[PDB]
Structure formats: structure tokens, C-alpha cells
């Protein structure tokens, strides 16, 4: 028995979810003949109020396809320096996609300073290959992107005729925490990546959502990168289950994280950045070893709660920290 | 309700396979903690007599990762012009991996002429970025590569200190049909891609097999291309089931494929496994008879094609004249 | 004191050409303010009957910029397997430009079989990133591309909505040899690369010619690859000189190459196809290559799978007779 | 004639340089048989105290080849966000070379904070393709990179097993201004790009300098990108002339830049930091008023320069030219 607070990616499929997977109807998705994948994508597109959706094996591929579908060779994509697309995806957009990544300083709430983005945007000129895309992240390290800011960024992106992509790997965490609908949070975006394999608890994959044309380009690029699966409907049906059954209960992950951060408050902790299911802490190797020895797992120290974290688990790791001091 | 001879990719997971998936133990594969994936990779590496294995969502990615792990920016990979990596994978190796694809003419048996490969190989020179890889395909359009040729190609690549990669998407078809063990057919290769999502009947994915160092590079690139999954043990366990339970019965696909070609004696040396090649109005009639298939017409048999299906499509062809 | 038959690239600038360079007016080409470059480009574009032209340090960059301006990421370019763009430019179009190179068998006259090309073309589909370009080469190994063939390829390219690019590194050799003007030979093409640094005798560079939009893309890509020079008018003026003064005399290079092939095809032990001598190249085989090259090099005679001898303005009549004697001496 | 303070790239070849070009011996550089190019490369490599040198048509290609020769596919190169390699070369190293560019904040003197560099460095790992290169710039917007800082960065890169590349497009400006020789200033670097087509006054090209192995790779990539010229010895000999004859006189460009800046900073409506005038550049902003009306006014009087107004001095800028644009500014304000 381990208390795994390393990430919400360690979520296991519930028995009800496994049961759903057992009876999932499948087909060849390359021929577009998997009813499970078709259902998830149809449901996903409508849920976010967009035209089309595309199922992919990972959030990394979801973003990778997103940037390559917005930007061609040499074209620019502006994003945060602390964004996952920049920091934790091996710069695949540049290395594989020949896209010019244009990092700008990222703020606490995950916002990019309008002045920084505007200064970063390169025009379509004689010697300048134009910026084409701006990327945002919601949530960003468990923090919710403020909606008034989002509207302003949409305005800036429109001013230069650019596109707007959302890394919403933990979008529904922002939905539940802020109290705004998913429609309201993705309305200013042209494209959205949502991960099904974190808090939502599905075992594999993410969904890329956007316009028909955008998704059409992403689907062709998905084949090239190796994302074109066959009978993925079993996976897709699990992802569909997650969206229908595992969104509301995310509030508990937020509560236990809030309850965890409060208890841990020799530990420096800012409760203002505990807005969803993450707790960031600062005082390292002896601590991790100590915790490891007590069946407690995490990785600035980051603690993430999920559906396989329970009330007693929280109290055990609060005890463990107290004991450590 | 349809007789689907389009591809062996339309294979559905058996109920027994679904049960295996239901009870599969999983974990976060990125942390390497998925017991289902680890088991498949361990079994696969051992089955082919290699050091390590890597589970990926598709055969396209398996090959894509393979040449990029063999060939760095500007470096060359020699393969067949009719090879899947060249013709049917959007040249991802070049576009994404900056690898110089070096297609050579493909022979009847699916082999690459030794003279062509020798002539294609570019040395490590002042203005030449060296060829680093040679790719083969077994099977290729259902045809089995002769083993003496395989050992011989190994000799050629060794002569230039190169690597040898096998697209064995349909390797086990070649195993069953030729009568050689899997070990004998993958021995000349440095790396092997085997597809689990075709004849073997698993719903998703392939296995890339090779040395520890090679797979280590492939595993790093898998993360970049977006192949890094979480609880893929459910998928992996199905792949494990397929390898353990669905290899022997591939002979039936070969039997039904051969009997199909035999039946088309109205109005054959390339029928060695589960494919039948023949040379729009035709498609309309066949579709109307619940018959689905795909310049040259390709008919593919698999575990959801039965004896009555075969004679039914033979009847359609005869009736069509 | 060497007889250099290795290539027509070893051509040195004449004193007249040097004088022209000395008095060349220059400026910052990045600002488009070099009168020498602009003059060469204006003249070059007009000579080939296209809208715009771009001066580049090499024919390799000329072709590299050409396919990348025709083909974006993942898009396809059909070419000959023996074409320079495929065989001798390190596949930069693919490695650097993410262009899908699509080789088809290349014939003797440099033509690509329409059936082979038609079979290679990938449509704009759900899973197929479209072919966008077909590349041809004139001359190809000193051989002239047949003009009737071009019209038919032009037909095919229009039928599939593609572009057509000509590697005319030695185009003016084909002009002199065939008796057709340069305009007639580039008319079916959307874009043309011509090399100034071979038979024409300019010391550096090539010209990429095409539409305004195409060149605009090529000019921006030139900056990225590092081809954007400053006061290149000195080089450009030499190229203008070459185009104005060194085209007609290519007939002599062809004559000396033909007389060379005649002399060597008499000698026993020599295999030589005189039908392949149409311009300034002689391809030959012994009935080993390396011992011959060392033997020739020691006698101040330089050339290079198949033995290739290339004539240019620094080859004279006596030079031809000396290497004929040398082969005779060697055999 | 125009008084062109837009850039030092507009430098024209002197008659002496043109004479040198006329008598330049040439050959096919691809065969390595151009005596003019070989001489320039030999002289240049020794001048910077490195093993080998490579002649290229531009500084962009010099840097482009540099990063790709240090960094393989997916590998990382750390540089300044205000560095030319990042901002003004279309990210060719990334787009063409598949190199992961890693910008960090760049300071006034062109230095990168070591803490920022340490945070940027990715190790050779199971999932991070390692950083391989750190890039610096001297001069940077005409500022001179402090040598003690350089020593510290060398320590950092050795500690992490990285390479160090200098964009020394205006290195010799830093040489004259700081009083340190070119050898001392490039000693900590593994590779150096020097531009011949600016202050040095040669019409075309740059030199990439480094180890034999590094240059051998660069020479191969040069062929691929299209930098392999034939008889470029005429250009190279001009570059050789520039290095031998036009380095010392860079001090005059610096004097005229300072005299220019002093005259303009004595005018109301001008914001000018005289501490940022260390070489041949003067950066100024109006306090206030738009930039474009000033430029149009100046252009109409045969005066040319260029977000922030930048004035660059060179060998075709003379004292009377300087006094004339001060008068024009005075007249305009
Ligand atoms: C914000 C964000 N975006 C994209 C991804 C990539 O998704 P995949 O890992 O499914 O490719 C992650 C994964 N983040 C892992 C973690 O936070 O532990 C993420 O946190
Ligand atoms: C020999 C071969 N190799 C690789 C692949 C690609 O694998 P995925 O499709 O799983 O990515 C295929 C697909 N072949 C499809 C067919 O023959 O119908 C194939 O036939
Ligand atoms: C047909 C053709 N096209 C393009 C090029 C490339 O041009 P540069 O070498 O200027 O980059 C060459 C060079 N051919 C050299 C020879 O055959 O000797 C060529 O022969
Ligand atoms: C610091 C620096 N680095 C590299 C380059 C590129 O060199 P080429 O322009 O020769 O490619 C320049 C040109 N800078 C032009 C200017 O500042 O006006 C530069 O100033």
C-alpha cells in the first residue's frame, strides 16, 4: 500500500470504469469506424462547443499536434516559459515540427503579460516568418487562469490575426474550482487540449478539440507521428466515462489538497496557490527517502491529490511530516 | 454483417482477450510502474532474443522511433521504395526526424537487391553524412523473405558497420508460413518492430525490440512524439495474450487466403500468407454483397474471416464474371 | 600547369571579367540596395521570362530554396533518383526543410517517365500530405532534356495542380547544343535554377528565377539558411558579364568534348558511348579507374563510378591532344 | 551621397581592398583549392588561436553552422533572448537544424546570469535531451562583454561538460574598446563567429573558427545549406585585407560615436545613456515624439538611421558627417 502524491496521472481505473471498457464497441479508427472513439470525440466537441475532436494517446501528442496544426515550418508559437509544451515535451514542436517556440515570462496565475506577448509577436514580413499561435495553460501548476485576463489575450491575438490554443490538461479542475462552465472557459480558445488520464481517471489519452479544418490537419499529422490507433474505443469509452462521471468529484481532490496544505502549514507553503489538487512546498533527498520508507510518494516539492487519495492518507502524510520535524 | 477483407487491422478483441484486459494490472508507464507493459516488454524481448522492448500505440510509431534511434539528423536509412516506412508513413522519418530516406528498388520476393543497397550506402565523408541504417520488411505484402537472404543482408550491413532494422508488422505470419522459429528470423536484425494490432488481434499497438541502449534512445523519443502513455497495461496485456494465444492459428488465415486465391480460378506465388493480390464498379457489387476490400486489389484474411465467408466472396466473383 | 577536366566549376574569371568586378557598383543587398545584384536579378528574370530572380552563393542553395519555397513541411517533391537535388545536395530539402523527397527512376536524357511520376504523386487527402512539386534537370550529365517531353510533363503537372522546377545548372549548354532559346526551354517551368559558376565562368553563385510570390518566399528562406549577403554586387556583376559574354562560346566546349570522345573511342580498351556526348561532358569506362587517375594526375591531367571528363573555357585544342596522347600512352 | 548611420553593414570596399581583390588568386574552394580562402582561414584560425576556420557568405550561416555542429537533433543550446542567433536568424538552428533553443534573460552588457543558465541546463537523461551549448555575444548592441564574467561562464560550462560559442560579429570592436587582444577574448570559447562584412569593411562574409573536428562538421553542413562556393578567394582576400588593415581604425568609429552621442544628449527631447556608448553604436529615444517623423525628416536631408533609434558609425562616416546630423537634430528640435 502506497500513498502516491507524485501526480494525478497515477489514477487507476475504477471497477465501474473497467466494466464500461469491457463492453465498449470498437472498430478501426484509421477508417474512422470505431464507435467508441467517434462517440468520445462527438461528445467532447459538443461539450466544449467546438466543431470537431481528436483522440490521442497522450497530452503531449495532443499539444504537439495542436502547435503543428496551427504553425507550419518556421512559423512562431508564443507560450509561457513554464508551460508544459515548452518545458516538458522535449520541444517536440521545434525538433519535430520545425516550429519556432517563442517563450515569454509566465506569471503566478499562469498568465502571460500582454506586453511580453505583444513584444514577442513577429509580423509576416520580408525577413520575418510570422508568429501564428499563442498558447496558454489552465490549470497551470494547479492554479486557475483568470477569465478577465483570458478575454484580453483573445483581443491581443485577434489584433495580429493569430490563433489561441489552450493546454487544458487539468481544465476541469479550473471548471470545478472557479465555478464557471467548461463552455465559458474554452470560448475564447480556437483549440483546446484536455487530458482524460489525470484527475478524470481514464487510463490512457487526451482529447484535442477545435474547428473541423484544424482537427483535419491534426488527424493527418497524428498518422505521421504514430498516433493512429486501431480499436482504441475501449480506451475512448473509458475517457467518455471519465468526463460523464468523474468531473464533479474533482472537488474532493481540491478539498483533500486544501486539507493537506493546511496541515503542512519548517515547511514554507503558500496557501494562495492551492486552488485545485496541488500543493507546492519548500523547506531534500533525505525527506523523499524518509517518505519513501513510509510508503509515501511525491516529487519545489509537489504534492497532487486524486480519487485514490483518501482522508486517512492525508492525515498519515501530515503525521509523517510532523514526525520528520 | 460484413465480410471485411480490407486489412487484418480490423481484427476485434476476442471475449477471452477482453477478459484478460479486464483483469490487467496497471500503473504509470512513464514511471515504468505498469506491470502489464513491463510484462509484455520483458516477454517480447525474450521471445525475440533481444535485450529490451518498448510498447507503442502504433506500428508507424514503432518504425518512426526505430530509424530515428538509428539515424540522427542528416544520416541515412536505406529501405525499399515499396516499404511501409517509405510509402505509407508520411515520410515521418524525414519530416520529423530529419533522417535521409534512401529508397531502393524492391524485388519480387520483397527483398532488396544487394547491389542496390551497396550502391545506396553513403560513407562518412567530407561532404557525405553516412548511411547508418538498412530496413527490411517481413512480411512484405504477404510475401516471406528468404532467410539466407536475411543472413546475407546482415553481412552487407556489417561490412559497412551499419545497423539492420526489421519491419516485422507481420513477422509471425512469416514465422508460421516458413517454418522457421522467430529467433532464426530476427537473429540477423539489430532491431525489430512487431505489430500486435493486426493478425494477432490485439486492439492497439506494437513492440519495438532491440538492445538496451537502442531502446533507451527510442524510449526518450517516444516521449517527444507523444507515445508516452499512463496505464497502458490493459492494452499491453492484450498484446501479451495475442502473442501467447494467437500465433499458431495464423496458419488458418493462410489456409483461407490460399483457398481464396485457388477459388478465383475464373476469368499465386505471392500468396504465401494472408494476402491475395488481383488485377470501382467491382467494389460497388462486392460492397452490395457485404464484401469489403482494397492500383492493385488486396484481399486480407484474419481471425474474423471464416470458411463460409471465403466461398461467399468466391461466389460473388464468379457471379460477377 | 594542370589540364583540369574534373569539372566546369574550376573555371577562373577572365581579365575582362575581373575588370568588370573591379568597377562594380555595390550596396547592402539585405536592404535591396546593391545595384549590381539588382541588375543581375532584373536581367536574369527577364532572360528567362519570369517575374523575379534571386542571387545565391550556390546552385545547391538555389535548389534548396526552390523546393522549400514550393514545398512546406511534409509536402512532396518528385525528382529523379539521379538528380543532383536528390543525389548530391545531402538531401537538405528533407533534413533542413522537412520536405518529402520522392525519387523516381531517371532516364538517359534526364527525363522522368510520366507513368512513374503519376504513380508517385500523393493527393491532398485525409492521410496523404500532397505532392506539390516535380523537379527536372537540364542538362543532366551533359545530356539534353527533350523539349517535346516538357510539354507532356507540363500537361501532367497542370492536371494534378503541381509546380514545376528546373535545375538548369548547365541550361545554357542545352541552349547552345539544341538550338532552342533559353526562353523556350524554361517556358514550361514555374521556377528555374541556373548556375553562373560553371561553364559561364563567373567565380561565385547561381540564380533562382520564378514568380514574385515564389521569390519572396525564397528571399526570406535565404536569410534563414544564411545566404543573405551584403555587397555582393561584385559577384553579381561577374555573373552578368558571364551571361552576356560567355554563352555563345560554350559551343567550343562542346566541340572539344566531342573531339575528345572521338579520340578516346578509337583507342582499344576504352568503352565510350558517343551518343552521350551532346555538350561538354565525356563519360568513359575502362575494360581499374583509380590507377588511371593517379597516372593522369602525375602528368598534370585531372578528372574523376564512371570516369567523367568536363570541358570549359580553360581547355584548349592542345590540351585535348595531350590527354589523347596520355590515354594512348597508358594503354 | 547619403550619411548612412543605419548599420556598419553598409561599409563599402576601399580602393585598396578592391585592388587586393583584383589580384586575388582563386580556385575551387569545394576542392579546398582556393588559395585566397585557404589563406584567410589559416590566418583567421591562428589570429583567434584555434585549430581551423571556415569561410561563409554571412554571419547568420556562421552561427547557424555553429549551433548545428555543437548541437545534434533535439539537443539544447542556451542563449540570450536578445541574442542575434535567437531573435534575428529566424530560429534557423531550430527550424532547419532541429536544435532546441533555450533563451534566458540577457543583460545590458550582453551577459547571461549564471543562475539563469544553470536553471536552463537539461542533463543527459531518460526523458530530457541534454543541453550541449551556451552562446554569448560580443559585442551586444555595441556593449562590451566583461572579461571576468567570461571566465566565470567558462567555469560553469566545464562543470556541466558543455560547449561555448561566441557570436563575435563585432568582436574586434570589443577588442579595440576594451584593450584586450583578440586571443585573450576568445580563449575561453570553443568556437567563434567573426563578421568581416561590417566595421572591417569587407563586402561579403564571415569566418567560423574552432577545432578541426568542429569545423569538419561545419564544412559538411555548409555544403548542405548551400554555403559551398567555388572561386570565393576574391571575397576571402578582401576579408583577409580587412583583418590586416581595418582593425586599428575601429577606434575612430568609437570616437565618432561618442562625439555623436554627446552632441545629441545635449539636446532637449533626447534621452540618451552615454554609458551605453562603448563602441560604434548610439541608442536614443525621443522624450517624446514618434520615431518615424524624425526618420523621414532626416532622410530628406540625406541622413539615414533606424523600436529604439540606433545610430551606427563606420569607415564611411566622417567628422563632418557627425556634425551635420547633430545640426539636423538641432534643427529638428
Ligand atoms: C499541463 C500539462 N500539459 C500536458 C501534459 C502532457 O500530458 P501527457 O503526460 O499525458 O503526455 C502534462 C503532463 N504532466 C504530468 C504531471 O503533471 O505529472 C501536463 O501537466
Ligand atoms: C508492414 C507494415 N508496417 C507498418 C504498418 C503501420 O502500423 P500501424 O498502421 O499500426 O501504425 C503497417 C500498417 N498496414 C496497414 C495495412 O496493411 O492494411 C504495415 O502493413
Ligand atoms: C546539375 C547540378 N545542379 C546543382 C549543382 C549544385 O551547384 P553548386 O555546386 O554551385 O552548389 C551542381 C554542381 N555540380 C558540380 C559538378 O558536377 O562538377 C550540378 O551539376
Ligand atoms: C551580433 C550579430 N550576429 C550575427 C549577425 C548576422 O550576420 P549577417 O547579417 O552577416 O548574416 C549580425 C548582423 N547584424 C546586422 C545589424 O545589426 O545591422 C549581428 O549584428
XYZ file of N, CA and C and ligand atoms in Angstrom, chain A residues 6-9 57-63 83-85 88-89 137-141 167-170 195 197-198 205-206 278 302 304, chain B residues 28 30-31 223 226 228-230, ligand 1:
143
model
N 2.606 11.788 -6.143
C 3.544 12.244 -7.165
C 2.838 13.021 -8.270
N 1.688 12.515 -8.701
C 0.931 13.124 -9.788
C -0.473 12.541 -9.841
N -1.386 13.236 -10.511
C -2.730 12.707 -10.709
C -2.768 11.761 -11.910
N -1.604 11.504 -12.495
C -1.503 10.573 -13.614
C -1.528 9.125 -13.135
N -3.129 9.388 -27.832
C -2.552 8.580 -26.744
C -2.015 9.366 -25.548
N -1.699 10.646 -25.725
C -1.162 11.443 -24.623
C -1.447 12.924 -24.792
N -1.325 13.671 -23.700
C -1.491 15.112 -23.749
C -0.354 15.777 -24.504
N 0.825 15.168 -24.431
C 1.989 15.643 -25.163
C 1.720 15.617 -26.659
N 1.136 14.521 -27.138
C 0.815 14.413 -28.555
C -0.301 15.380 -28.917
N -1.243 15.560 -27.997
C -2.343 16.492 -28.205
C -1.826 17.904 -28.469
N -0.894 18.355 -27.636
C -0.283 19.668 -27.804
C 0.632 19.718 -29.020
N 5.438 26.748 -19.295
C 4.396 25.920 -19.892
C 4.925 24.531 -20.205
N 4.039 23.544 -20.132
C 4.416 22.155 -20.353
C 4.924 21.923 -21.772
N 4.284 22.584 -22.729
C 4.656 22.492 -24.135
C 6.101 22.944 -24.353
N 8.467 20.629 -20.792
C 8.403 19.192 -20.525
C 7.967 18.310 -21.693
N 8.094 18.803 -22.918
C 7.753 17.986 -24.078
C 8.911 17.935 -25.068
N -2.260 27.940 -20.518
C -2.357 26.720 -19.719
C -3.336 26.870 -18.558
N -4.348 26.011 -18.535
C -5.372 26.053 -17.498
C -5.831 24.646 -17.137
N -5.480 24.178 -15.944
C -4.746 24.959 -14.958
C -3.250 24.987 -15.233
N -2.557 25.872 -14.527
C -1.105 25.923 -14.557
C -0.569 25.681 -13.152
N 0.082 24.538 -12.954
C 0.530 24.113 -11.628
C -0.595 24.160 -10.598
N -3.759 24.680 -23.336
C -3.363 23.440 -22.682
C -4.239 23.252 -21.447
N -5.371 22.587 -21.639
C -6.316 22.354 -20.565
C -6.206 20.935 -20.045
N -4.973 20.485 -19.836
C -4.707 19.163 -19.281
C -5.485 18.944 -17.992
N -5.636 20.017 -17.223
C -6.400 19.989 -15.988
C -7.481 21.070 -16.016
N -6.889 16.530 -21.033
C -6.374 15.216 -20.688
C -7.401 14.406 -19.914
N -6.481 11.359 -18.727
C -5.682 10.395 -17.976
C -5.076 10.948 -16.686
N -5.658 12.016 -16.161
C -5.231 12.536 -14.869
C -6.358 12.425 -13.854
N -4.757 8.598 -22.538
C -5.081 9.519 -23.611
C -5.652 10.881 -23.276
N -5.747 11.705 -24.310
C -6.278 13.048 -24.190
C -7.164 13.329 -25.388
N -3.309 20.557 -6.123
C -1.855 20.570 -5.983
C -1.384 21.351 -4.765
N 6.244 18.927 -4.971
C 4.883 18.987 -5.491
C 4.051 17.793 -5.038
N 0.220 16.070 -5.288
C -1.004 16.081 -6.082
C -2.012 15.041 -5.583
N 1.553 3.637 -13.796
C 2.017 4.722 -14.655
C 3.262 4.281 -15.425
N 5.027 5.813 -17.619
C 6.067 6.837 -17.655
C 7.035 6.664 -16.486
N 6.514 6.248 -15.337
C 7.371 5.934 -14.200
C 7.866 4.491 -14.292
N 8.598 9.741 -25.830
C 8.049 10.810 -25.011
C 7.815 12.063 -25.853
N 4.932 11.806 -28.430
C 3.638 11.731 -27.776
C 3.164 10.316 -27.496
N 4.097 8.454 -24.948
C 4.221 8.135 -23.536
C 2.889 8.051 -22.811
N 2.377 6.831 -22.682
C 1.076 6.581 -22.070
C 1.172 6.295 -20.572
N 0.020 6.277 -19.912
C -0.050 6.034 -18.474
C -0.334 4.565 -18.162
C -0.245 20.911 -18.076
C 0.171 19.652 -18.790
N 0.097 19.582 -20.143
C 0.452 18.490 -20.845
C 0.927 17.330 -20.237
C 1.322 16.136 -21.073
O 0.384 15.074 -20.970
P 0.910 13.560 -21.051
O 1.820 13.429 -19.855
O -0.355 12.734 -20.991
O 1.648 13.485 -22.366
C 1.054 17.276 -18.759
C 1.572 16.038 -18.063
N 2.035 16.352 -16.724
C 2.448 15.274 -15.843
C 2.343 15.664 -14.388
O 1.887 16.795 -14.109
O 2.714 14.841 -13.517
C 0.659 18.488 -18.008
O 0.740 18.538 -16.649
